[PDB]
Structure 1
Amino acid sequence: MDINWRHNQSTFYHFTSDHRISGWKETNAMYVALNSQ
C-alpha cells in the first residue's frame, strides 16, 4: 500500500497538458487568460 501510494502520488509530476490545471484538474483558465489579453 505504501509503495502504491508513493508511485500514485508520483503520477502527474512530469505532465504536459495545458488546458488542465496540474495535468488533470479541469477549469476555464483558457477563457480567463484569453479574455484578459
Structure 2
Amino acid sequence: MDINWRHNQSTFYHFTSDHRISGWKETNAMYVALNSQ
C-alpha cells in the first residue's frame, strides 16, 4: 500500500497538458487568460 501510494502520488509530476490545471484538474483558465489579453 505504501509503495502504491508513493507511485500514485508520483503520477502527474512530469505532465504536459495545458488546458488542465496540474495535468488533470478541469477549469476555464483558457477563457480567463484569453479574455484578459
- TM bin (shorter chain): over 0.9
Moved over 6 A (4+): none
| Unpaired stretches in structure 2, ≥5 consecutive residues | none
In the superposition, the TM-score normalised over structure 2's length comes to 1.00
5+ residue gaps, structure 1: none
Matched-pair identity in % = 100
RMSD: 0.0
Q: How many residues align?
A: 37
- Please state whether the residue corresponding to 2:31 is helix, strand or coil: helix
